[PDB]
Design a protein around this nucleic acid. Structure first.
Ligand SMILES: Nc1ncnc2c1ncn2[C@@H]1O[C@H](COP(=O)(O)OP(=O)(O)O)[C@@H](O)[C@H]1O
Ligand SMILES: Nc1ncnc2c1ncn2[C@@H]1O[C@H](COP(=O)(O)OP(=O)(O)O)[C@@H](O)[C@H]1O
Ligand SMILES: Nc1ncnc2c1ncn2[C@@H]1O[C@H](COP(=O)(O)OP(=O)(O)O)[C@@H](O)[C@H]1O
Ligand code: BEF
Ligand code: BEF
Ligand code: BEF
Ligand SMILES: [Mg+2]
Ligand SMILES: [Mg+2]
Ligand SMILES: [Mg+2]
Ligand SMILES: [Zn+2]
Ligand SMILES: [Zn+2]
Ligand SMILES: [Zn+2]
Ligand SMILES: [Zn+2]
Lengths: 337, 343, 371, 374, 366
DNA sequence: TTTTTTTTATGTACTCGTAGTGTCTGC
DNA sequence: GCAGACACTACGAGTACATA
């Protein structure tokens, strides 16, 4: 997904919110909860296009007006966007402070003002708290739009302010049909990709479009080699990358399917890789699988959360600890009770 | 483009000044001596006006306009001295040096000093523009293998009787600080007019003013010298170096050690070192390190390193300077380490 | 047009007198007694949870302090000072979003300007909300003023986390704690609001909104606005139940029965069925924890079990009869840690899967088939 | 009393003479001896926790330095200088709020005027409040001033954490340390306050207030003012207990006993009563944990219990000698894990009940019965 | 006023002759020989810890260099130049509080006087005190002056941290590093100072005062004056012991010592005192954990003592030798669990007490 | 013998160069 | 007038350091 592709699974919610916004019964601060690539960006863009210019027929775009000319070119000064600096990774509180004071300085063109945060989960504590008063009491006809993948990660003091909207994932069969139309791959691979992305067709499309599929198949081959021999260290060659958290999530998914197979669950998530799950079930004990799953999830969370942490050291330590666990007579860890 | 050592500098200085002299290295004492000798011989040749400029992203850049080629009003030959930053020149400093070199003339002698330039910068346009006109002086700190010979040579320079034990003590206390060593020799000459130097006072007129680098610490770890490793760690902590640079320097070598130990069971270390492109200085050191350590010790080391990294970048605590110490003892001549203390 | 913008209930229904509070009586009694007598202080620090009323309480305190009727426990909206305080544009009430301006320079400028006499107001009230975000330099700057301020200066601070504030600042102010609102108070306030707004509602929807508000009235109002937007202009039980993903069937009960029976196939089939209908996982885990709590209570006292879950009483009675208390406690602990772990491994489905697998691990899953 | 101006107790009752200062006998005796005998040092640093007197004692020393009756250890209230000091309008008591004037330029300005002599005073005092707030350059600008000050200038510094000052400053200035006030001292001072001010009070409420603001008297004064506000202008036990959110020790120990003797119905009844009273559940867990810790301490030594819990002292002993310490360790661990995991329970009431039920199930002596069917 | 006149012990007793400086023998001897042979470097930079005489020795150097009797290690008090050095009003001695005159404007103004000949002295002597803090451009001006210094000007730089000084100034300055004063020398001079004044004293009290100061003479004298004030005009052992107990800070070490010996009453008294001396309980427990870590590490190799434990080495060596590694490991695990468990406990004093009780319960002491 | 090597977010001082502002001096 | 000079004050930028 390059940029802002309209999604049919977004059409219903969209009009509903328009019905709320057109009648003047819409909350100023709306927090979107959607999966990565679910299309929340397109929803926010369409909403802002509706809001920020002369009233169109009442639906669709805003026609051919000054608002559309400025918005499409990205020149509208009443369309404030909060995006992390590419050199950094988080929304500096200075950017939010500047945006809030600029909003306080009244609009420039006719109409309302729209502030859009490209991702709420990337807000630091100071940046998140710098928005509290502005959300509580917007100056005049100010509408916010915050996108997130889970509202619980966001501060409780901010989740109170915003009316929460939920973009439910599309039904799995419909998403499978859509992806098969969009991408020519076998049904099993399609299903595994969809379940890997928690039913987010946009995320699955992003996974297929890039090299992520090649990385996943390389990781699968490396796991197939490593599982019987017990030489998990080689997996490092496939795990160290800028997308390390996603590959660790894939590994955790494989371990989850292995435990599922041990319990014989009717449903799995790595459908198109039965050989690896069979090998993992055969060669590894359920307690060992659970321990490895816990360690992998913990390492993924530590990599994703703590900014600046060294990827290579953590991945190597995880692999060596797994190596230690595979050896007989080694006490496995348990969740912190 | 002449290349020289400080000891040979007089040989070039008494022959005739070149267009410019470049004083590259990391020894304050050697660079200071070379610069002072060049300035002294220039004054003997009739150079009187000296201007010193420090190369900085915000410093003045009037040095270009300072080449008026019109001093003739007084006609005092000028010497220009430039101080490069810690990391060397940047692009902007590159073209500044280009335009300074383009305006060089006979009446002006240019003295350039700073940290040794890397290969990426040794091909810079200005440095090439100094070809056939410049004399580089190599001033790099002698290592502990070569340091005592240098100390003995300087003691003979001052006509002082240096004992072997005194030489060893001074080498141990003032490692990596040549200026401190010169000051100590002067101070001990002042304390003892007789000229001899023996233990009873050279162990008294000395301090632990040694300056180290993370590479020295990693070398101490590889050679398994616990006492030197701990002393180096203490000196680095006192100096104030950031612990993250220590963590990275040790992480690189520890990961290489883990990979080499894993591959040693199937391939001789001689081919493994060449495949991993290990320099001849470090091949034997890493061979001894591999022969000393087992897989379990390396696994414990990496576990401790990971815990230190987490407690540094997540809790922001100051316990790192302790944990590194344990990691030191974890990899030297039978660590005899623990689990709760690290795990 | 009375609503140029949507005056959301979280803003339109801000209290204007002391009688509009939903029951913060412990602090209101102290405030009324202090205003009624001469006992007035120069530093009030209201703390507590989100959306509980401390900013509104502070604004009401300012209104009572500055109204030209006098120092009245009940402020009068007729007063011009109250008219200006309820809106913006009051020369005396200086409201500073502390998180917006954390720099010590702004605090130093404020403390330079505090010296001047108030304009036409009895007390120059400084209302600093979200005070816990101020930089430590500003915190230390706010020490010597709060201890011996000019008589005409009153400081009102509000924060959601007293611990983050330095102990020195807490030591100079009156600390009021605003307890989280109970279910009944929130439900009564919501029914009063909806009756005043001529919007239809149902008691079950109001009860669900109060339950999900987690003790914060602003959460209740936001959920009510969610229901209004997604309920076609009325608060209906179906709309709120659907939006909250709450459980009306025995899915949680069947899931915990399968888990305690250690039937992994049944557990995973039920979890897959739950994923099919898109049941919210956090609510499922909360319901399972509540059911396990009821199991423990009935094990301790069978009479306590007699509750709303009457139609399913036999099942919980059998589970209490057949399961030791230690296993129930281990199950509750595992599910609770799992609930702590939902906002980890962003795909929450596999998070609940992890929690269920950990819970299942305690009992033997041996392939040994025995009755 | 008669003052219709209800001045805050934190402000009205600031110490006037060295006789009005409670506690801190160390600093009080040191200053009295160093001012009666002479030998006044040129820099003081009062280091202590919050609300112990880090500033008022400095003002008392300032009064004692330049008084009309000469250098005296008893600051009078008759001469103009002392009253001007108390009003804060005194000419020579330059009160440097170091938090505001923290930049090095302001410190240079302060040092520039040091030699310009005092006006209507034996000494000029530079009372620098919160010195731990100055910048590094500001800290170091005044070194040679502190080491060799003029004969008429005396510094009086007051910081909460001296560890943040550079070590040389700790060298130059005298290091006076003020210990946190004890509970009995706080109770006596509050009794003095509520007797001088005509407010009816009850001793149990005063003890509760003193304990709830441990180590800091200004905390106690603020809590007492807020309790006067909460009550009908009188410090009663009910008002203080309801305000603090604390639960009376007798009833918490009653819950603890019901837990120890495995009486589930009594535990449930007490929980229901606490729910009816509106006491915060986490506060109930906190009180139970504190009582269990006190039980452990009295197992360590019977002297660990002061008069504070005297009302139930006997019961305390009857819990110390009847159960082994390992049971206390298990109980403390269970209740503490419960407190840690409370915020994620279905409800705070549900979480507290489940924690108590877990402590009841897992406790060794007479545990809960297990199902008859294996 | 009506209290006669009593100065400060820190400012008084400052040495006026090289024989009155106690300790730092190597620096004084080197300076004496350099002045005797006429071998004087252009710039002398003093360095060392606080309160070891760097400024005082520099002032003595400035007095000696301009003495009319000649450059000597023992300048007389007779010379009017020497007397003006005493009073602080000497035209040829330029005392620059570089901690206050950091800006390049003032430094350049005061360094533009190098062109002027001394008024009544052989050498124009600059005493730039606290040189470590100084603007970068002021360092440039000072370096330009020192590169081509007039023959009638000598520099006397003083500082506490020589690291902050640029290397270009260090390479041009003869650096003299001063050691932290040994305890015996501190006690000896404290005895002599107390005897020269009309103050009674006690031997154990004197030893306690000497040990309390961390090798710095100014610290020792400041504590001496404070104890005299608290001691009712007498340096008595009980009064100074109580004073130092009030000012006692290294609580964690005593806590470890009491915990490892299973002394319940002692550890309870220590934690009560640490509560009265208002501190942070998390910081105390972290310090205890770190001390236990160090004790565990020292048993593996003595070199772990390092430099930080120079004033703590005596007790740490005994603790490391006398305690088995397993007990130290168990104590470290208990304290780590307690620190993880502390915030969720009741008020943190209760949690620290409970963790200490947990650690104490391991030993069979009853 | 030669290169080798870093974790950010937010804030607070400090000091120098360049410009903007006042004002007033014999110009 | 008077505008330049000269002061004087403020602002950006580069650097160093602190706390979390
Ligand atoms: N005690 C209360 N009485 C009535 N409404 C309340 C009360 N507390 C909160 N609210 C509602 O919550 C909204 C926000 O309240 P606010 O006072 O800002 O809470 P906070 O203390 O977190 O700042 C108000 O607009 C009002 O609708
Ligand atoms: N030792 C004390 N005796 C009597 N009152 C005290 C004492 N310490 C603090 N207080 C009370 O606290 C108020 C302010 O005390 P203060 O001396 O400012 O503490 P700090 O040391 O923090 O500046 C005083 O007005 C007084 O009522
Ligand atoms: N070597 C010493 N001999 C005698 N007194 C000393 C010595 N070092 C420090 N002192 C004492 O400390 C006081 C201040 O000493 P000073 O030399 O100013 O220390 P600094 O090195 O920090 O400038 C002196 O008055 C003197 O009493
Ligand atoms: F939302 Be409130 F100010 F805590
Ligand atoms: F209120 Be005190 F000066 F900390
Ligand atoms: F005067 Be010293 F440097 F403390
Ligand atoms: Mg608020
Ligand atoms: Mg104070
Ligand atoms: Mg000094
Ligand atoms: Zn349009
Ligand atoms: Zn009114
Ligand atoms: Zn008086
Ligand atoms: Zn003389």
């Amino acid at each position: 997904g390059p940029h802002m592709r309209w999604y049919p699974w977004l059409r219903p919610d969209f009009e509903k919110l328009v019905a709320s916004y057109q009648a003047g019964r819409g909350h100023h601060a709306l927090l979107i909860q959607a999966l990565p690539g679910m299309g929340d960006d397109a929803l926010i863009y369409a909403l802002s296009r509706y809001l920020l210019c002369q009233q169109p027929q009442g639906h669709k775009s805003c026609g051919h007006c000054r608002g559309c000319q400025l918005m499409q070119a990205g020149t509208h000064p009443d369309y404030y966007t909060l995006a992390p600096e590419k050199g950094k990774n988080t929304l500096g509180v200075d950017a939010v402070r500047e945006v809030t004071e600029k909003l306080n300085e009244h609009a420039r063109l006719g109409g309302a003002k729209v502030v859009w945060v490209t991702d709420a989960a990337l807000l630091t504590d100071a940046a998140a708290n710098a928005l509290l008063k502005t959300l509580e009491e917007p100056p005049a006809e100010t509408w916010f739009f915050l996108a997130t993948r889970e509202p619980e990660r966001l501060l409780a003091t901010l989740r109170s302010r915003c009316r929460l909207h939920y973009l439910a994932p599309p039904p799995e069969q419909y998403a499978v049909t859509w992806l098969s139309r969009e991408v020519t791959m076998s049904q099993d691979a399609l299903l595994a990709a969809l379940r890997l992305s928690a039913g987010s067709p946009g995320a699955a499309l992003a996974l297929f479009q890039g090299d992520n599929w090649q990385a996943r198949e390389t990781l699968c081959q490396a796991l197939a080699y490593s599982v019987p021999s017990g030489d998990w260290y080689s997996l490092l060659a496939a795990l160290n990358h800028e997308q390390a958290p996603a590959r660790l999530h894939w590994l955790a998914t494989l371990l989850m399917d292995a435990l599922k197979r041990h319990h014989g669950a009717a449903q799995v998530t790595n459908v198109d890789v039965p050989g690896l799950v069979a090998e993992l079930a055969n060669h590894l004990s359920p307690s060992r699988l659970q321990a490895i799953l816990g360690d992998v999830c913990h390492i993924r969370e530590q990599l994703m959360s703590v900014t600046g942490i060294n990827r290579e050291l953590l991945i190597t330590d995880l692999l060596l600890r797994i190596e230690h666990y595979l050896q007989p007579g080694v006490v496995l860890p348990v969740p912190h009770l | 483009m002449i290349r020289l050592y400080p000891e040979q500098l007089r040989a070039q200085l008494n022959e005739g000044l070149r267009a410019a002299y470049l004083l590259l290295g990391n020894d304050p004492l050697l660079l200071q001596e070379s610069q002072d000798a060049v300035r002294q011989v220039a004054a003997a040749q009739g150079f009187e006006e000296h201007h010193t400029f420090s190369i900085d992203p915000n410093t003045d850049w009037n040095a270009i306009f300072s080449l008026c080629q019109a001093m003739s009003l007084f006609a005092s030959r000028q010497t220009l001295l430039l101080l490069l930053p810690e990391n060397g020149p940047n692009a902007a400093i590159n073209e500044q040096l280009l335009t300074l070199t383009g305006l060089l003339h006979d009446d002006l002698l240019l003295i350039v000093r700073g940290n040794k330039l890397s290969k990426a910068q040794e091909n810079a346009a200005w440095f090439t523009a100094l070809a056939n006109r410049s004399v580089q002086v190599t001033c790099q700190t002698p290592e502990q293998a070569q340091l005592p010979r240098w100390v003995a040579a300087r003691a003979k320079q001052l006509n002082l009787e240096l004992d072997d034990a005194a030489n060893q003590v001074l080498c141990y206390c003032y490692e990596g600080n040549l200026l401190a060593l010169a000051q100590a020799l002067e101070r001990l000459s002042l304390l003892w007019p007789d000229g001899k130097l023996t233990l009873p006072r050279v162990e008294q007129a000395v301090n632990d003013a040694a300056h180290f680098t993370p590479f020295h610490w990693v070398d101490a770890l590889l050679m398994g010298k616990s006492k030197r490793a701990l002393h180096i760690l203490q000196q680095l902590r006192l100096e104030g170096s950031e612990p993250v640079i220590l963590l990275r320097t040790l992480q690189r070598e520890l990961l290489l050690l883990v990979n080499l130990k894993r591959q040693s069971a199937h391939t001789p270390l001689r081919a493994l070192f060449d495949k991993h492109r290990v320099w001849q200085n470090r091949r034997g050191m890493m061979g001894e390190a591999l022969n000393r350590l087992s897989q379990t010790q390396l696994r414990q080391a990496v576990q401790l390193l990971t815990r230190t990294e987490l407690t540094l970048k997540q809790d922001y605590g100051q316990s790192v300077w302790a944990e590194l110490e344990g990691l030191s003892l974890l990899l030297c001549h039978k660590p005899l380490a623990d689990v709760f203390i690290d795990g | 047009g009375p609503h140029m913008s949507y005056q959301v209930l979280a803003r339109k229904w801000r209290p204007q007198t002391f009688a509009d509070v939903v029951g913060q009586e412990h602090v209101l009694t102290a405030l009324a007694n202090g205003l009624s007598l001469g006992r007035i202080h120069h530093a009030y620090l209201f703390s507590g949870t989100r959306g509980v009323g401390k900013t509104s309480i502070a604004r009401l305190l300012a209104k009572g302090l500055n109204c030209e009727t006098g120092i009245t426990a009940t402020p009068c909206g007729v007063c011009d000072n109250c008219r200006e305080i309820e809106q913006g544009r009051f020369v005396d009430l200086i409201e500073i979003d502390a998180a917006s301006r954390t720099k010590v320079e702004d605090t130093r400028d404020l403390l330079d300007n505090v010296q001047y006499a108030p304009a036409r107001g009895r007390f120059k009230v400084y209302l600093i909300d979200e005070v816990h975000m101020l930089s430590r330099h500003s915190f230390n700057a706010l020490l010597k003023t709060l201890e011996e301020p000019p008589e005409h200066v009153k400081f009102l601070l509000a924060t959601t986390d007293p611990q983050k504030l330095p102990v020195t600042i807490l030591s100079r102010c009156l600390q009021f704690h605003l307890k989280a609102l109970d279910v009944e108070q929130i439900r009564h306030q919501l029914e009063h609001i909806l009756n005043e707004e001529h919007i239809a509602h149902e008691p079950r929807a109001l009860q669900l909104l109060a339950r999900a508000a987690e003790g914060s009235l602003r959460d209740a109002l936001s959920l009510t606005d969610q229901a209004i937007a997604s309920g076609d202009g009325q608060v209906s039980t179906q709309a709120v139940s659907a939006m909250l993903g709450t459980l009306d069937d025995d899915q949680a009960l069947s899931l915990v029965e399968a888990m305690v029976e250690a039937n992994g196939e049944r557990v995973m089939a039920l979890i897959n069925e739950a994923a099919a209908r898109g049941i919210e996982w956090e609510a499922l885990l909360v319901e399972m924890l509540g059911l396990l709590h009821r199991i423990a209570m009935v094990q301790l006292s069978p009479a306590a079990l007699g509750n709303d879950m009457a139609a399913i009483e036999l099942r919980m009675r059998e589970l209490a009869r057949t399961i030791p208390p230690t296993d129930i406690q281990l199950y509750y602990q595992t599910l609770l840690i799992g609930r702590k772990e939902l906002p980890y491994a962003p795909d929450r489905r596999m998070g609940v899967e992890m929690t269920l697998l950990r819970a299942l691990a305690f009992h033997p899953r041996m392939p040994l088939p025995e009755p």
